[PDB]
Amino acid sequence: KDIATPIRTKEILKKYGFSFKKSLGQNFLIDTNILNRIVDHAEVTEKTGVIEIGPGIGALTEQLAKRAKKVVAFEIDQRLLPILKDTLSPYENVTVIHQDVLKADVKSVIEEQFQDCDEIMVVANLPYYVTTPIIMKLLEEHLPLKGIVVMLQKEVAERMAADPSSKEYGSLSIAVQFYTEAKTVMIVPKTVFVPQPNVDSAVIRLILRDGPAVDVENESFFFQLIKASFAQRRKTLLNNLVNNLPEGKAQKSTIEQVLEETNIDGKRRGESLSIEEFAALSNGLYKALF
């Protein structure tokens, strides 16, 4: 049987369950069809190089290996790596890196690992608390990736893919869509996981854009500005800028003046700004504040 079946996963966890500490939000996929559907949505073929993050006991890694040219899995826990040497032993095209993807130089790994591939995808099942930090880290690294297809919490996907008119729109939406075209593609039933989460979760497809969605002087300042602006959503933009930028209180009157100079009423709520406005605002504030 495949790793992604309830009988095989149960057996592996029974054999090796005392050999690793269960972590925050850790689960194990036990439905082969769902995985292959996710792999369909990622468009993985014989020429695709796939990066997986957090391979678990190999469930998804296995389905990827059967379809991709090659699979590189990041795993921080050596105890889990020891388990994959059992569960992934049939697959030559799987290379496991004992490294935290957040600390990794992913561009070199890709050069090192994917020479015989035509396109690189990220495909991974991510626990809530690392979802946003991993995705932004990867996107800020400007990697030569076609796309990222990730299993995550439904609300997080919805936020990432939100369009400007919808209620889910926030700083996360803007940050992800700066880099990518984002769409939530499946709702995954709770029953494909061990242990089982309380609710259905989701899969998000992020296709990387040819270049940035808007023109900014400093990407990092732009993302800090967005974050600062949405911190207390219902309060005014000016108020948010004052209390959430380290420059806020020290340079209030400059901030006021940059809003005036860019024709953006600081009495408006942060959520009312388009991405084009936030861009123009970041550029003005970056030049005036540093």
Coordinates of C-alpha atoms in Angstrom, one line a residue:
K1 CA 0.0 0.0 0.0
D2 CA 1.0 3.7 -0.4
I3 CA 2.1 5.7 2.6
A4 CA -1.1 7.8 2.1
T5 CA -3.6 5.2 3.2
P6 CA -5.0 4.8 6.7
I7 CA -3.6 1.2 7.2
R8 CA 0.0 2.1 6.2
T9 CA 0.1 5.4 8.0
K10 CA -1.2 3.7 11.2
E11 CA 1.6 1.1 10.9
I12 CA 4.4 3.6 10.4
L13 CA 3.3 5.7 13.3
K14 CA 3.0 2.6 15.5
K15 CA 6.5 1.6 14.5
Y16 CA 8.1 5.0 14.8
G17 CA 5.8 7.0 17.1
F18 CA 8.2 7.0 20.1
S19 CA 11.1 8.1 17.9
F20 CA 9.9 11.8 17.3
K21 CA 8.1 14.5 19.2
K22 CA 4.7 15.5 17.8
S23 CA 4.8 19.2 16.8
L24 CA 2.4 22.1 16.5
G25 CA -0.2 21.4 13.9
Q26 CA 1.5 18.3 12.6
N27 CA -0.6 15.9 10.6
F28 CA -0.2 13.0 8.2
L29 CA -2.1 12.6 4.9
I30 CA -4.1 9.4 4.5
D31 CA -6.0 9.7 1.1
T32 CA -4.1 9.0 -2.1
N33 CA -6.8 10.4 -4.5
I34 CA -6.8 13.9 -2.8
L35 CA -3.1 14.0 -3.0
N36 CA -3.1 13.2 -6.7
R37 CA -5.8 15.8 -7.3
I38 CA -3.5 18.3 -5.5
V39 CA -0.7 17.2 -7.6
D40 CA -3.0 17.7 -10.7
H41 CA -3.6 21.3 -9.6
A42 CA 0.2 21.8 -9.3
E43 CA 0.6 20.5 -13.0
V44 CA 3.5 18.3 -12.0
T45 CA 4.9 16.3 -14.9
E46 CA 8.1 14.2 -15.7
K47 CA 10.0 17.5 -16.3
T48 CA 8.9 19.3 -13.0
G49 CA 11.2 19.8 -10.1
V50 CA 9.2 19.9 -6.9
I51 CA 10.2 21.4 -3.5
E52 CA 8.3 19.9 -0.6
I53 CA 8.4 21.4 2.9
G54 CA 7.6 19.2 6.0
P55 CA 7.3 15.8 4.3
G56 CA 5.8 14.1 7.5
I57 CA 6.3 10.4 7.0
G58 CA 6.3 10.7 3.2
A59 CA 2.6 10.7 2.2
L60 CA 2.7 13.5 -0.3
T61 CA 6.5 13.2 -1.0
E62 CA 5.7 9.7 -2.3
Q63 CA 2.9 10.9 -4.8
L64 CA 5.2 13.6 -6.0
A65 CA 8.1 11.3 -6.6
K66 CA 6.0 9.1 -8.9
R67 CA 5.1 12.0 -11.2
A68 CA 7.9 14.5 -10.9
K69 CA 11.4 14.5 -12.4
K70 CA 12.8 15.1 -8.9
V71 CA 11.6 16.1 -5.4
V72 CA 13.6 18.1 -2.8
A73 CA 12.0 17.9 0.8
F74 CA 13.1 20.2 3.5
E75 CA 12.8 18.6 7.0
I76 CA 14.3 20.2 10.2
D77 CA 13.8 17.0 12.3
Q78 CA 16.5 14.3 11.9
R79 CA 14.2 11.8 13.6
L80 CA 11.7 12.2 10.7
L81 CA 14.5 12.0 8.2
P82 CA 15.4 8.6 9.7
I83 CA 11.8 7.5 9.1
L84 CA 11.8 8.6 5.5
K85 CA 14.9 6.4 4.8
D86 CA 12.3 3.5 5.5
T87 CA 9.2 5.0 3.9
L88 CA 10.8 6.6 0.9
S89 CA 13.3 3.9 0.1
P90 CA 11.8 3.0 -3.2
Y91 CA 12.5 6.5 -4.7
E92 CA 15.8 7.6 -6.2
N93 CA 14.4 10.9 -7.3
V94 CA 13.9 12.1 -3.7
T95 CA 16.6 14.2 -2.0
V96 CA 15.9 15.3 1.6
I97 CA 17.7 18.4 3.0
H98 CA 18.1 18.6 6.8
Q99 CA 17.4 22.3 6.9
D100 CA 14.8 24.8 8.0
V101 CA 13.5 26.3 4.7
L102 CA 13.2 29.6 6.5
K103 CA 17.0 29.7 7.0
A104 CA 17.9 28.0 3.7
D105 CA 19.3 29.6 0.6
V106 CA 16.7 28.1 -1.7
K107 CA 18.1 29.6 -4.9
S108 CA 21.4 27.6 -4.5
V109 CA 19.6 24.4 -3.5
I110 CA 17.6 24.8 -6.8
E111 CA 20.7 25.3 -8.8
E112 CA 22.3 22.4 -7.0
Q113 CA 19.4 20.0 -7.3
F114 CA 17.2 20.9 -10.3
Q115 CA 19.6 21.1 -13.3
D116 CA 17.7 18.4 -15.4
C117 CA 14.2 20.0 -14.7
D118 CA 12.3 22.6 -16.8
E119 CA 10.1 24.2 -14.2
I120 CA 10.1 24.3 -10.4
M121 CA 7.0 24.1 -8.2
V122 CA 6.5 24.2 -4.5
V123 CA 4.0 21.7 -3.2
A124 CA 3.5 21.3 0.5
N125 CA 1.1 20.6 3.4
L126 CA 1.8 23.4 6.0
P127 CA 0.8 23.8 9.7
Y128 CA -0.9 27.1 10.5
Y129 CA 1.8 28.8 12.4
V130 CA 4.5 28.5 9.7
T131 CA 2.1 29.1 6.7
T132 CA 2.5 32.8 6.2
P133 CA 6.2 33.1 7.3
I134 CA 7.2 30.3 4.8
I135 CA 5.2 31.6 1.9
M136 CA 6.4 35.2 2.3
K137 CA 10.0 34.1 2.9
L138 CA 9.9 32.1 -0.4
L139 CA 8.2 34.9 -2.3
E140 CA 10.6 37.5 -1.0
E141 CA 13.5 35.4 -2.1
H142 CA 12.6 36.0 -5.8
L143 CA 13.1 32.4 -6.7
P144 CA 12.8 31.0 -10.2
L145 CA 9.6 29.2 -9.4
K146 CA 6.6 28.7 -11.5
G147 CA 4.2 28.4 -8.6
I148 CA 3.4 27.3 -5.1
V149 CA 0.5 25.0 -4.3
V150 CA 0.0 24.6 -0.6
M151 CA -2.4 22.9 1.7
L152 CA -3.4 25.2 4.6
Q153 CA -6.3 26.5 6.7
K154 CA -9.3 27.6 4.8
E155 CA -9.5 31.1 6.3
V156 CA -5.8 31.7 5.5
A157 CA -6.2 30.6 1.9
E158 CA -9.3 32.8 1.6
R159 CA -7.3 35.7 2.9
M160 CA -4.4 35.1 0.6
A161 CA -6.6 34.9 -2.5
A162 CA -9.2 37.6 -1.4
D163 CA -10.0 40.2 -4.0
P164 CA -10.2 44.0 -3.0
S165 CA -14.0 44.2 -2.8
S166 CA -14.4 41.1 -0.4
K167 CA -14.3 41.1 3.4
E168 CA -11.3 38.8 3.7
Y169 CA -9.0 41.4 2.0
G170 CA -6.2 42.4 4.2
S171 CA -2.5 42.8 4.4
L172 CA -2.0 39.2 3.6
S173 CA -4.0 39.5 0.4
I174 CA -1.9 42.4 -0.8
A175 CA 1.4 40.9 0.1
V176 CA 0.7 37.6 -1.6
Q177 CA -0.9 39.2 -4.7
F178 CA 2.1 41.6 -5.1
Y179 CA 4.1 38.6 -6.1
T180 CA 1.5 36.1 -7.4
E181 CA -1.9 35.4 -8.8
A182 CA -3.7 33.6 -6.1
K183 CA -6.7 31.3 -6.2
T184 CA -8.2 28.8 -3.6
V185 CA -8.7 25.6 -5.7
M186 CA -10.0 22.8 -3.3
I187 CA -11.6 22.4 0.1
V188 CA -10.0 19.3 1.7
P189 CA -12.2 17.2 4.0
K190 CA -10.9 16.9 7.6
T191 CA -10.9 13.0 7.1
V192 CA -7.8 12.9 4.9
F193 CA -5.6 13.8 7.9
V194 CA -4.4 12.0 11.0
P195 CA -5.0 13.4 13.5
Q196 CA -8.1 15.0 12.1
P197 CA -8.6 18.7 12.3
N198 CA -12.0 20.1 13.4
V199 CA -12.9 21.5 10.1
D200 CA -12.3 21.2 6.3
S201 CA -9.1 22.9 5.1
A202 CA -7.9 24.1 1.7
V203 CA -5.4 24.2 -1.1
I204 CA -4.2 27.4 -2.6
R205 CA -2.5 27.9 -5.9
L206 CA 0.0 30.8 -6.2
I207 CA 1.3 31.5 -9.8
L208 CA 4.3 33.8 -9.7
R209 CA 4.0 37.0 -11.8
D210 CA 6.4 38.2 -14.5
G211 CA 7.2 41.1 -12.2
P212 CA 5.9 43.0 -9.2
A213 CA 2.2 43.9 -9.3
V214 CA 3.0 47.6 -8.5
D215 CA 6.0 49.9 -8.6
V216 CA 7.8 50.4 -5.2
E217 CA 11.0 51.9 -4.0
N218 CA 11.4 49.3 -1.3
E219 CA 9.6 46.1 -1.1
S220 CA 10.3 45.6 2.6
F221 CA 9.0 49.1 3.6
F222 CA 5.9 48.5 1.4
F223 CA 5.0 45.3 3.3
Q224 CA 5.7 46.9 6.7
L225 CA 3.4 49.8 5.6
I226 CA 0.6 47.5 4.7
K227 CA 0.9 45.6 7.9
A228 CA 1.0 48.8 10.0
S229 CA -2.1 50.0 8.1
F230 CA -4.3 47.0 8.8
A231 CA -3.2 46.4 12.4
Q232 CA -6.4 48.1 13.9
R233 CA -8.6 47.8 10.7
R234 CA -11.5 50.0 11.8
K235 CA -9.3 52.9 12.9
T236 CA -7.9 55.6 10.7
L237 CA -4.9 55.1 8.5
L238 CA -3.1 58.0 10.2
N239 CA -3.8 56.5 13.5
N240 CA -2.5 53.1 12.4
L241 CA 0.7 54.7 10.9
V242 CA 1.4 56.6 14.1
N243 CA 1.0 53.7 16.5
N244 CA 2.5 50.8 14.4
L245 CA 5.6 52.2 12.5
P246 CA 8.6 52.7 14.7
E247 CA 8.8 56.1 13.0
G248 CA 5.2 56.8 13.8
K249 CA 5.3 59.0 16.9
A250 CA 8.7 60.5 16.2
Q251 CA 7.7 61.7 12.6
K252 CA 3.9 62.2 12.9
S253 CA 3.9 65.6 11.2
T254 CA 6.0 64.3 8.3
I255 CA 3.6 61.3 7.9
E256 CA 0.6 63.8 7.9
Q257 CA 2.4 65.8 5.3
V258 CA 3.2 62.9 3.0
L259 CA -0.5 61.9 3.2
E260 CA -1.4 65.4 2.2
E261 CA 1.2 65.5 -0.5
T262 CA 0.0 62.2 -2.0
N263 CA -3.8 63.2 -1.6
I264 CA -4.7 60.4 0.7
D265 CA -7.0 61.3 3.5
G266 CA -5.6 59.9 6.7
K267 CA -9.1 59.9 8.2
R268 CA -9.8 57.0 5.9
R269 CA -9.6 53.4 7.2
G270 CA -6.5 51.4 6.1
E271 CA -8.7 48.8 4.5
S272 CA -10.0 51.4 2.0
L273 CA -6.7 51.7 0.2
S274 CA -6.1 50.1 -3.1
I275 CA -2.7 48.4 -3.7
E276 CA -1.8 51.3 -6.1
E277 CA -2.4 53.9 -3.3
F278 CA -0.4 51.8 -0.8
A279 CA 2.4 51.8 -3.3
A280 CA 2.3 55.5 -3.8
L281 CA 2.1 56.0 -0.1
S282 CA 5.1 53.7 0.6
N283 CA 7.3 55.5 -1.9
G284 CA 6.4 58.9 -0.4
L285 CA 6.9 57.7 3.2
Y286 CA 10.1 55.8 2.5
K287 CA 11.8 58.9 1.0
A288 CA 10.6 61.2 3.7
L289 CA 11.2 58.9 6.7
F290 CA 14.8 57.6 6.2

